[PDB]
Design a protein around this nucleic acid. Structure first.
Ligand code: PRO
Lengths: 50, 78, 94, 64
RNA sequence: CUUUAAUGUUUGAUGUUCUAACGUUGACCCGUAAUCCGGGUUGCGGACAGUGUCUGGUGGGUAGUUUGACUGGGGCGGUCUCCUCCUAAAGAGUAACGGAGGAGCACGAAGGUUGGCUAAUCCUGGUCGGACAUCAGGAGGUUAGUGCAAUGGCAUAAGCCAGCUUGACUGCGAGCGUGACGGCGCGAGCAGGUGCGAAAGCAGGUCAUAGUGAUCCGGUGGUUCUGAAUGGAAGGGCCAUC
RNA sequence: AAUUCCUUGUCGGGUAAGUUCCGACCUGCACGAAUGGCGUAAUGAUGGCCAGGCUGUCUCCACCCGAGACUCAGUGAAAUUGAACUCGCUGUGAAGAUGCAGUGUACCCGCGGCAAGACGGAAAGACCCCGUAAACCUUUACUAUAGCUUGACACUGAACA
RNA sequence: GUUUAUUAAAAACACAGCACUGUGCAAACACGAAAGUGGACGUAUACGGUGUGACGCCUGCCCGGUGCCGGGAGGUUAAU
RNA sequence: UGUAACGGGGCUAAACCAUGCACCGAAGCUGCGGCAGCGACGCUUAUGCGUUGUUGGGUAGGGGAGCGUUCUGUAAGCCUG
RNA sequence: AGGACCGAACCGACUAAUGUCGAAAAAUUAGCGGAUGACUUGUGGCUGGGGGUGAAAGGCCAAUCAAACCGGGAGAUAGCU
RNA sequence: UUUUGUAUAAUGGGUCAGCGACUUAUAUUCUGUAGCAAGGUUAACCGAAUAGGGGAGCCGAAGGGAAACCGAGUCUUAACU
RNA sequence: CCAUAGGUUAAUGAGGCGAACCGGGGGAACUGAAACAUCUAAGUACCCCGAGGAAAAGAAAUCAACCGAGAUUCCCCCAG
């Protein structure tokens, strides 16, 4: 409900995305996770989008 | 008048599926249980639901070890 | 979505019908043999609030409002508007 | 008159080479982000219609 | 922004004048022996009214319809999916408007790993300081804790703390568990790529069990897989998702 | 109270005795002023109550007169009906027995009467529930629509401000 | 006076009166896709609707709600 | 409504308990005769048997095997004043 | 003079009994109300099915009325007997 | 007949005779059966016509995949133990 | 005023009936959707007009696939 859902978009050339949740009104700094990109087959940084 | 109860749940079907000396093919669930009532022993894995799954097509055998006497589940290899 | 039925709400449950928010002040829920149920609801207008009297049936009634009445601190005036601050979370309000 | 096919079942099943039927699993159209990717791997390929509800599929599509 | 004036301003907003559309249920004349109709003049209205199409409003005037089920008759009241315990008769399962409680989440750390640590409550002594804060010692033993109800579990801790961290990873998955079915659960291992650790190893979320909804229709991103003569595209499909 | 629940309110009148009637009080569950309030002569096959006269209404029925009923001659229906050689009782039993069990009683068959029973006859219960039944009716139910109403284009033009 | 022909004749309906309201006449309104008719060969002392119901004394306060009437600054809003 | 709380008569055992043998009692069981299904078999056969083993209550319901009726061919045949 | 009065015809339908496989699918008998009027009656017109008409009862519209009758869609549909 | 259960005082039938309720069409699947057999069979139509022509077609011998595409393999996947 | 409008007279034609088929104008609802409103039933029933022995359609501003086919109607496939 409160904890809305965001979209971690890959910082590689492709548009693979992970989707997840984040409570924005308590910790509003963006997520800078480092996840596996199955298009590049590498482990590049992901970044929050809507 | 009225009532406030009448609510329960889908019975989870727990307990032991494969008993004592009864050959189990690897990966076969043996005990489906809430916590670690039965602990994993030789050749038997423990899942994320404390379901002790077999790991080697063999027998079963329960025991009691250490200084806590916890039924333990091993796997004789046949 | 927060839909309400008229046999449910007690008092203070803020409802939203006909483009305006309403506070319920009180409601008397009656139903008589060989009739259906109705709740003679003593509402309160919220934007232009004098009073309003609606006698709802048992069905239906209205959606609720985002209607938070929290403590704000008056601290500022400029032209027209009047700014406020929460002493719990420090969010702006105009 | 010849039997008319239920057209909605025609778009959801397909005959395999020994009489069975294949169907797409039914949980993978929306609220997916609360599902684990273990469920969103096993629901992705095609399934086979079970022995119980196989007679209801044969009756509602006779030509396929 | 807020005023002022010039121009091409897009123009609408109304407001007199006119007669030729139009109206006349005003007079006269003729069809005509006819308080109908038509024509002929004249007067008064007059681009209004009225009508057609499109359109917003109002519209029980009128029409088609809906108005749930369980229920110790029905109405009323309560309840409807999920999780925990009992009833449940020591495998599983098991009903009642049987007896009790909870959920419609939270968390980027409260997840992963490595390294350490051990509670509750009384007791005495001690500045402010008390029944109770912090300090010290003892008794005590997990009566504590476990993000949240209950049960099972927990010292190798799953409980407490600190560092590094993103395995809360993609493709699969032998084998079972459990449902009439849709489905749901567990899962060693395999490939790719990472994290932590000297390493052995662990890690595809959290102590487990609630925290949730099928299809259809549609939205966004990706992928030339199709693309109604052909070339594109549109629209479909697949994949990720809402 | 055409309105009052409690309630036959309490008080007074009437009666030997009055839950009704009449007067009054006011604690009006829940009167009330044109969905009219309160009076009101007259009128009413109007509602309640009391009195005189009157009586078989009644105590409590008696008798008489006619028409049926009854017998006889003639004509000649009907509802009804599984079949019946169609008793009482106590029990049992789909839980109220002519039919079962135990038992008692009863010669065969009419006729006039009376209706306690045959869950007697008539009417596929109207009450109650049920059907994803039907009809009408209501409205701030849902979706439409006639009618009313607004503006644009058309019929529809000419002059200036 | 009228009423449920065939279980209800009443306290119901009607009524003269009263008041509100619509209607300026090609009237409101009704019937009708429309023509046309009724209203009415009438014209506000007239007609339609609605409530009340002879007469006597009367008819109190409330415009928040809903309808109605009036107003147009502003906001919202259709076709085009 | 009528005894009406052994079924009734009636019983002081014809009641109760113990122990003992007799007998009654079912469509059970056995005997004797027939019938049908199914499974085995031997040796036969177009399948039967001294055989043998067993089986045969039945609603909803499934399976099997038939009878009879009218009409068409066999049939201008056959039966029949 | 009068929706004045008493009361026959005419019109009605208040009470009671009888009748309720009736004499009659609503009548008879004994009483009862209006009876110069918002009266009654004869003849002939007119208004129609979601329509008429209605001093209003949802009454009446051919012994039918909360939507007539007839024919058709039509063997509507019936998870019920 | 309906039922948990009917002598039931639950339904139904006065009786008799006649009539009165699982059909027909076209598709589809399994069972039997007959034909031919990696083949089988035609539909309209033509026809001196329940013959013979007519192979238009239909099902089957090949699957996998959403599809392109590939083929005794194919899909999944960057690749399959 | 010419002329038209109207009147007259003649000539010729139609009018009405009819079972089905046939083209047009208007057009349901029950039902099915296990309720219902989109939808179905169904352009069905039904109503009205119009002709013929048949009627309507009919000589590509038709399809096709880059090769081609040659008006319309009807039957069998494609094809549930
Ligand atoms: O019930 C009711 C009516 C009165 C007697 C029985 N039937």
């Amino acid at each position: 409900g409160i904890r809305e859902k965001i979209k971690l978009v890959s910082s590689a050339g492709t548009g693979h995305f992970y989707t997840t949740t984040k409570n924005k009104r308590t910790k509003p700094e963006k997520l800078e996770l480092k996840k596996f990109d199955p298009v590049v087959r590498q482990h590049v940084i992901y970044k929050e989008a809507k | 008048g009225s009532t406030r109860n009448g609510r329960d749940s889908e019975a989870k079907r727990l307990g032991v599926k494969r008993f004592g000396g009864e050959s189990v093919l690897a990966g076969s669930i043996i005990v489906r249980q809430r916590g670690t009532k039965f602990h994993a022993g030789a050749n038997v894995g423990c899942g994320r639901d404390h379901t002790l799954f077999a790991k080697a097509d063999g027998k079963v055998k329960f025991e009691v070890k250490g200084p806590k006497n916890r039924k333990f589940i091993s796997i004789e290899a046949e | 979505m927060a839909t309400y039925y008229s046999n449910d709400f007690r008092a203070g449950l803020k409802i939203m019908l006909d483009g305006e928010p309403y506070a319920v002040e009180a409601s008397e829920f009656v139903k008589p043999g060989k009739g259906q149920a109705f709740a003679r609801v003593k509402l309160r207008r919220l934007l232009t609030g004098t009073r309003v009297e609606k006698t709802f049936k048992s069905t239906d009634s209205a959606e609720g409002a985002d209607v938070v009445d929290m403590n704000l601190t008056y601290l500022y005036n400029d032209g027209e508007f009047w700014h406020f601050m929460n002493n719990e979370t420090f969010e702006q309000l105009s | 008159p010849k039997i008319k096919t239920v057209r909605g079942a025609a778009k959801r099943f397909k005959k395999t080479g020994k009489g069975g039927f294949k169907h797409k699993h039914a949980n993978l159209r929306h609220i997916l982000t609360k599902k684990a990717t273990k469920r969103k791997r096993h629901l992705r390929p095609k399934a086979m219609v079970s022995k119980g509800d196989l007679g209801l599929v044969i009756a509602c599509l006779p030509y396929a």
